[PDB]
């Protein structure tokens, strides 16, 4: 008869993201004439740590195309980039790690990261540490390109979408065991209030479908409907299968 | 062994509530407020301190409070860039311009040949 | 002011400097707590390095 924890997540106010010390969103430059037709040079000024994010971020300074001022940007750092390196963004940029190129100019089999979904969205795919996308094939007829996402899914995107050559830096982070609850506490302290987690069978019936009973047990199949209403949809949602491979 | 009390209505030992113990001509100890330690100007290229400028609070650098010689360095980018950084910038500018001229003349010669 | 003399403390200091009241029955802290070996090592290093210089 009580709202369950998963339901209470949506309202927020204690489950909102912790973003006080973050350095701002990481994204490409806004797509403009120079990047659409030629190339624009930038210089990496700093590689910084973004709290709550495994991948490091790189500060890049560009010369504004038509204003007398500096154009400052914050890119997701690709492995191998360094302070003082020159970064080239555009259709005519060379195929080197760190450069941002339109997918039409990236040959098949290349390794890219922070791939745009819509032309000009400034990067949504393959952004986490150690992740990358692979260019599969190009379709000149309809101006679309096929890529392989980190999850293994194959997606078709317009060939005008941009991507950064190389893989995201910071790879191999998750292979290290934490060994203790304190490390997880520190990890999630900067992400959101999602830890520790209480098992549903440890609760009373009033606050979870798994609650209750003189023994700890679910008492009914943990696989639930895709259309099950909130508060009832707990456990393995719309599972096509369960158990080991 | 005289024991002291805060001179102001601040009752917590924060960074801005620092003090020193001074002996007055009256023979008694007393607190006196001391400003927080501040880092002086720093060179963004090398990250090291800028020589010739004292380390004061930002308001202590005001023109009406500090002499001009104390807050200036007689060189291009004086007080902003270190000497080595300025030298590197000058050399880089000169050499890059020279290489630009070399590229232009090479392109002109190649065009003439063809 | 009420009398609180230091004469006994000074006499005890003299006796200690003569080596009195320093036996195993007069020690409560460990040898480390009484005098850390780190302090002795630092002293020896400073002395020997100064002599070498």
């Amino acid at each position: 008869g009580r709202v369950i924890r998963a339901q209470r997540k949506g309202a927020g106010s204690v489950f909102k993201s912790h973003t006080h010390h973050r350095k701002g969103p990481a994204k490409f430059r806004s797509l403009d004439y120079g990047e659409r037709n030629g190339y624009l040079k930038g210089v990496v000024s700093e590689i910084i740590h973004d709290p709550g994010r495994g991948a490091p971020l790189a500060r890049v300074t560009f010369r504004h195309p038509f204003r007398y001022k500096h154009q400052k940007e914050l890119f997701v750092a690709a492995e191998g980039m360094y302070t003082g390196q020159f970064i080239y963004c555009g259709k005519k940029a060379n195929l080197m790690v760190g450069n941002v190129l339109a997918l039409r100019s990236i040959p098949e089999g290349a390794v890219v990261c922070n791939v745009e979904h819509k032309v000009g969205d400034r990067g949504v795919f393959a952004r986490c540490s150690g992740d990358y996308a692979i260019v599969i094939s190009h379709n000149p007829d309809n101006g679309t390109t096929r890529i392989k996402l980190p999850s293994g899914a194959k997606k078709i995107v317009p060939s005008g979408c941009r991507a950064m050559i190389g893989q995201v830096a910071g790879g191999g982070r998750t292979e290290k065991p934490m060994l203790k609850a304190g490390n997880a506490y520190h990890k999630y302290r900067v992400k959101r209030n999602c830890w520790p987690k209480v098992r549903g069978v440890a609760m009373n019936p009033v606050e979870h479908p798994h609650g209750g009973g003189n023994h700890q047990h679910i008492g009914h199949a943990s696989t639930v409907r895709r259309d099950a209403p909130p508060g009832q949809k707990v456990g393995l949602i719309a599972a096509r299968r369960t158990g080991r491979l | 062994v005289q024991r002291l009390t805060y001179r102001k209505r601040h009752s917590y030992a924060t960074k801005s509530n620092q003090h020193r113990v001074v002996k007055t001509p009256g023979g008694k100890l007393i607190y006196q407020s001391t400003k927080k330690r501040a880092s002086g100007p720093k060179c963004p290229v090398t990250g090291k301190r800028i020589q010739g400028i004292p380390h004061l609070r930002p308001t202590e650098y005001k023109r009406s409070r500090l002499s001009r010689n104390r807050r200036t360095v007689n060189r291009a980018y004086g007080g902003v860039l270190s000497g080595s950084a300025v030298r590197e910038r000058i050399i880089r500018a000169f050499l890059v311009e020279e290489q630009k001229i070399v590229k232009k003349v090479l392109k002109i010669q190649k065009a003439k040949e063809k | 002011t009420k009398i609180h003399s230091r004469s006994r403390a000074r006499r005890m200091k003299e006796a200690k400097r003569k080596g009195r009241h320093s036996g195993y029955g007069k020690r409560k802290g460990t040898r480390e707590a009484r005098l850390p070996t780190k302090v002795l090592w630092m002293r020896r290093m400073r002395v020997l390095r100064r002599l070498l210089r």
């Binding site: 700093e46 590689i47 910084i48 740590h49 495994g54 991948a55 490091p56 790189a58 750092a77 690709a78 492995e79 191998g80 980039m81 360094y82 302070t83 003082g84 060379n94 195929l95 080197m96 790690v97 040959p107 089999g109 290349a110 390794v111 540490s129 150690g130 990358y132 050559i165 190389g166 893989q167 830096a169 910071g170 790879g171 191999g172 982070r173 292979e175 290290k176 065991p177 060994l179 203790k180 | 090398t46 990250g47 | -």
Partner: protein
Amino acid sequence: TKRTKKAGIVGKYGTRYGASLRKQIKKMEVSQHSKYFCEFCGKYAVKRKAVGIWGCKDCGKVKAGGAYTLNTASAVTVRSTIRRLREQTES
């Protein structure tokens, strides 16, 4: 004297977390706290600042690398693949 037979750096954990986990984390503990060769200045002065960030104490260059090593294994393969593709395109 040989202070530990085999523990080495993981001796700080005492008898906690299990032998297998200590052995597994020993590799990361050694690698992330070690010095790495700097290509730019030719010195063994590259130290990890934060996960994925590696700065050189000598020349001051900062590089984005692996979480616990300066260069991940896949980084070299990615560089080789990109070089091959660039050479094919240029040719």
